[PDB]
Ligand binder design. Structure first.
Ligand SMILES: Nc1ncnc2c1ncn2[C@@H]1O[C@H](COP(=O)(O)OP(=O)(O)O)[C@@H](O)[C@H]1O
Ligand SMILES: [Cl-]
Ligand SMILES: [Mg+2]
Length: 287
């Protein structure tokens, strides 16, 4: 095997790793690093090339090409540099200092997220998904753990990460956290942009109620809830949620994918229409 990207010797010459570990999976690690020349902070993701007895270098290349195609979208994480060694490919990514949006879905921090904030974050997520779909890209893993924030105090902007499952529209299809799988995946139907819209419905549900819409006592119950779309819209859970927000969710969590609205249509939903009160509004009647 011959290596393609920059050598490991150059990496240790230009960067130094810090003690802040950001994430760890079974075939990947994310750790903060700093440039020796400028002092800027970055996030370095180490990806193993061999997995489950299979060579996956080609798949990593495909993921890099997707990041490159969306370089000009502010809602998608930026790729700075790439390095390679015997067993790993290393991605130098923009650093999101705010962490996962999943932190805002817990009953602990629920007291600091206003309606204006939720409206803004959803809007920004739709802007990134619309950009991807316009290029025939489907993320297929829009969990709250893969949607980050640039800042937390105050609240920053959205950054989407983790493109390991990206595909073109029409590719054939059953793994991942069961509670986030769309009904068409459990039925082995082809891939469609509507799948990402189903996941957007879950994000909004979790931000507004701080509960999971489909998780059950075990995996068997979770699958029944999904295939039957059994969701809790009770008084107790929605006492402080507006009707327009409820309408937004109920139009996305529908069994038939052909009935879900597109990203472009979602951006025109009445729940997201808001006027910045610091601007001078010009009515329809002139002087
Ligand atoms: N650019 C980043 N800035 C800050 N934290 C990050 C960044 N990228 C990933 N992380 C953190 O590392 C975790 C794992 O990253 P991810 O790309 O989702 O890899 P995996 O395939 O193991 O899920 C994320 O959940 C997030 O908390
Ligand atoms: Cl490491
Ligand atoms: Mg991930």
């Amino acid at each position: 095997e011959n290596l393609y990207f920059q050598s490991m010797e150059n990496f240790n010459n230009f960067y130094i790793l810090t003690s802040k570990e950001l994430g760890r999976g079974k075939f990947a690690v994310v750790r903060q690093c700093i440039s020796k020349s400028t002092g800027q902070e970055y996030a370095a993701k180490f990806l193993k090339k061999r997995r489950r007895g299979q060579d996956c270098r080609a798949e990593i290349l495909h993921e890099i090409a997707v990041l490159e195609l969306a370089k000009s979208c502010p809602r998608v994480i930026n790729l700075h540099e790439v390095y390679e060694n015997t067993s790993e490919i290393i991605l130098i990514l923009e650093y999101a200092a705010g962490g996962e949006i999943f932190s805002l879905c817990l009953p602990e921090l629920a007291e600091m997220v206003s309606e204006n904030d939720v409206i803004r974050l959803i809007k920004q997520i739709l802007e990134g998904v619309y950009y991807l779909h316009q290029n025939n890209i489907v993320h297929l893993d829009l969990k709250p753990q893969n949607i980050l924030l640039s800042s937390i105090y105050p609240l920053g902007d959205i950054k989407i990460v983790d493109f390991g499952m990206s595909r073109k529209i029409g590719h054939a299809c059953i793994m991942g956290t069961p509670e986030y799988l769309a009904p068409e995946i459990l039925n082995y139907d082809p891939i469609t942009t509507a799948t990402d819209m189903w996941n957007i419905g879950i994000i909004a549900y979790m931000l507004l109620t701080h509960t999971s819409p489909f998780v059950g006592e075990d995996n068997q119950e979770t699958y029944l809830n999904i295939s039957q779309v059994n969701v809790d819209y009770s008084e107790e859970t929605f006492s402080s949620v507006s009707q327009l927000a409820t309408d937004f969710i109920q139009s996305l969590l529908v069994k038939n994918p052909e009935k879900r609205p597109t990203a472009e249509i979602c951006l025109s939903h009445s729940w997201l229409q808001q006027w910045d009160f610091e601007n001078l509004f010009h009515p329809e009647e002139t002087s």
